[PDB]
Structure 1
């Protein structure tokens, strides 16, 4: 439509002139007031996908950190995405690091950030997710759309687990899945939770808290899980790419022993030095330059877990081609972030088109057939 096209001009303009986090908040606001366009197209039934009994109408969603506070869930989903991951949230509100903390290099289609864990806190965000869930009962276009919640610990909290336990109790009833990220380069001490021993501990503790939600309520699943699945939320974990081969296999074991529901590969990276505008900057890099690193990480973990744990792709996905690399590498689902920044609101419509056409030309019957074909 012209709707998309006109908006994308405004965005390209904003991208050139205006600060990144200012732009982000501006368009989140436009989405909050529901003046963004819709993709009302039927999605190809041949590009369906799932992770266990969690079904996605199409294989593209938005990654955590994009709508941290769940203020814009409807509008973003209606751009053509099958799901969104809100957060990362923490039990208490944070301001995050000092601004500016997000910068973009257009030529390389990359971003670096040191947001450091800004969100309105779990309590307020739960009210936002509840309001959405109420809207979802009335909106034809939100049916079968999935909302995951990314959860993490406040800055100065001694134990991670006590933070996540609070988050699950408050918001776990409204979530279709829970993403645990011990993968973030913006707060010190988070990533050491990636050891196998502490991880196993965290993962178990999360499943037990979710399982406890079921036990302590007296209602049936219909009137207990105020989400889309109407079941208890799945448990994913998100991994940073800056690990060595021993760490990755050590972790790979854990995820199996815990029987986790999926792994999100990957988060941002600190190991990129060839971006000129970014040399002054600290933080984690995302976008195109993260693409090849990310994909490799999927192949590794796909092999190390011996293909029992489903994978969710994140890192430099812009095109239907990029998407297929992640799928053949072993991903069931893809998440976009940087693409929305650089390609705009058309990204979902566009990338779904490109992938559908490729699946044809590559002779795939459906998307599931292509999963892990390396």
Structure 2
């Protein structure tokens, strides 16, 4: 009963319920990152079921659960977070220059509804410093066989005062792209003014094509170099995903889907936080995007819509209110190939990955599936 390396060790839940009621949200988060920075977190290095693995094109996820963007904005404890049991992490969102973000306090919890509202505003150390942090992980990954198949994506955005979003996305590609297994284009943060306008079809199309061209030029101009270009897990060109906001009318969603089909995006992350929820009186006079259990149903329906609007041709990364194995299977049967957690880590703590992986495997048994891949999109028939 001193096996503190186990993520289900009873003391973690005790400290977490105390943090939930007494300690500011962002302070809790930085404490978590500090523990990870000094390699003090517990870990689960045990073998995941081969029957729950999954892929998005050439990305082979050893299990279906990763950590959503914004949890390690700066990529300072990638190793430790992955070793909790996750198969991947999306670091960022990063911007070309660093930013302190919007005013504090700016992260608020509501345990009753297991929901969060945040107005962070892309607080990050900037692309060049996060790149150095990612490079250090990649060098450790080379020596550590036990991280050889874990995946790291990078969410990229724009500084608050940048005029043309595309300039900032290009800068991030040219510095950090060679180290990422995939790039997530963030056009859906509710906390950078004017950012969500880039989900307009014409603007979005130009953004996607510009990003893909820059990644292609990066390879075009550098694959001949002595040092092997792709210092990442896949040893290939990063795939490109788009993260969308749930707050869109049906016409926009269809017009976006048309653009995703034409531009050949490699996947879509559905979804970001919402500004549609106001029936949480603890959040009643706060600003930003709402995460957690109150976002689950909205984003699951959104997965179903974009799965159908893209005629099942665009793989889907699920994000939004995933806490349980039942939640994960709802997302997958809705059309998702992988799931991302944030709010689950806030309210369930260290045990998040180990327990949700166990619950999913039990579900795949009880529901009669041979493997997780068989369940993808099964709601639609």
Count the aligned residue pairs.
374
Go from structure 1 to structure 2 and tell me whether the alpha carbon gap of 1:328 and 1:220 turns closer, same or farther (over 3 Å shift). Answer: farther
User: CA shift at 1:151, angstroms?
Assistant: 0.1
Q: Is the 8 A contact 1:222 1:230 kept in 2?
A: no
TM-score (norm 1): 0.98
User: CA shift at 1:143, angstroms?
Assistant: 1.6
* C-alpha distance after superposition, 1:163-196 (max 9, x if no partner): 0000000000000000001001101110111100
Distance 2:52 2:350 in 1: 20
Aligned to 1:2, what secondary structure does the other structure show? coil
User: CA shift at 1:317, angstroms?
Assistant: 0.1
Go from structure 1 to structure 2 and tell me whether the alpha carbon gap of 1:11 and 1:141 turns closer, same or farther (over 3 Å shift). Answer: farther
Partner of 1:198: 203
Distance 1:5 1:330 in 2: 35
Deviates more, 1:52-61 or 1:222-231: 222-231
Aligned to 1:224, what secondary structure does the other structure show? coil
User: CA shift at 1:81, angstroms?
Assistant: 0.1
Match of 2:260 among 255, 258, 272: 255
Distance 2:80 2:133 in 1: 14
Aligned to 2:154, what secondary structure does the other structure show? strand
Partner of 1:120: 125
Distance 2:223 2:336 in 1: 37
Match of 1:334 among 331, 339, 358: 339
Q: Is the 8 A contact 2:90 2:154 kept in 1?
A: yes
* C-alpha distance after superposition, 1:39-85 (max 9, x if no partner): 11100000010001111000000000000000010000000000000
Distance 1:172 1:14 in 2: 36
Two-structure CA RMSD over aligned residues (Å): 1.2
Q: Is the 8 A contact 1:78 1:141 kept in 2?
A: no
Residue 315 (str. 1) matches residue 320 (str. 2): yes
Go from structure 1 to structure 2 and tell me whether the alpha carbon gap of 1:130 and 1:269 turns closer, same or farther (over 3 Å shift). Answer: same
Go from structure 1 to structure 2 and tell me whether the alpha carbon gap of 1:137 and 1:96 turns closer, same or farther (over 3 Å shift). Answer: same
Distance 2:287 2:307 in 1: 30
Unaligned regions of 5+ residues in structure 2, if any? 1-5
User: CA shift at 1:283, angstroms?
Assistant: 0.7
Q: Is the 8 A contact 2:66 2:339 kept in 1?
A: yes
Q: Is the 8 A contact 2:8 2:351 kept in 1?
A: no
* C-alpha distance after superposition, 1:322-371 (max 9, x if no partner): 00000000000000000000000100000000000100110000000000
Match of 1:79 among 74, 80, 84: 84
Q: Is the 8 A contact 1:89 1:150 kept in 2?
A: yes
User: CA shift at 1:9, angstroms?
Assistant: 1.8
Go from structure 1 to structure 2 and tell me whether the alpha carbon gap of 1:220 and 1:319 turns closer, same or farther (over 3 Å shift). Answer: farther
TM-score (norm 2): 0.97
Distance 1:335 1:208 in 2: 27
Q: Is the 8 A contact 1:91 1:153 kept in 2?
A: yes
User: CA shift at 1:93, angstroms?
Assistant: 0.4
User: CA shift at 1:12, angstroms?
Assistant: 2.0
Go from structure 1 to structure 2 and tell me whether the alpha carbon gap of 1:46 and 1:218 turns closer, same or farther (over 3 Å shift). Answer: closer
Q: Is the 8 A contact 2:268 2:317 kept in 1?
A: yes
Q: Is the 8 A contact 1:169 1:209 kept in 2?
A: yes
Distance 1:135 1:8 in 2: 30
Go from structure 1 to structure 2 and tell me whether the alpha carbon gap of 1:16 and 1:301 turns closer, same or farther (over 3 Å shift). Answer: same
Go from structure 1 to structure 2 and tell me whether the alpha carbon gap of 1:208 and 1:344 turns closer, same or farther (over 3 Å shift). Answer: same
Partner of 2:232: 227
Distance 2:362 2:223 in 1: 48
Distance 2:7 2:264 in 1: 47
Aligned to 2:175, what secondary structure does the other structure show? helix
Distance 1:219 1:176 in 2: 20
Aligned to 1:213, what secondary structure does the other structure show? helix
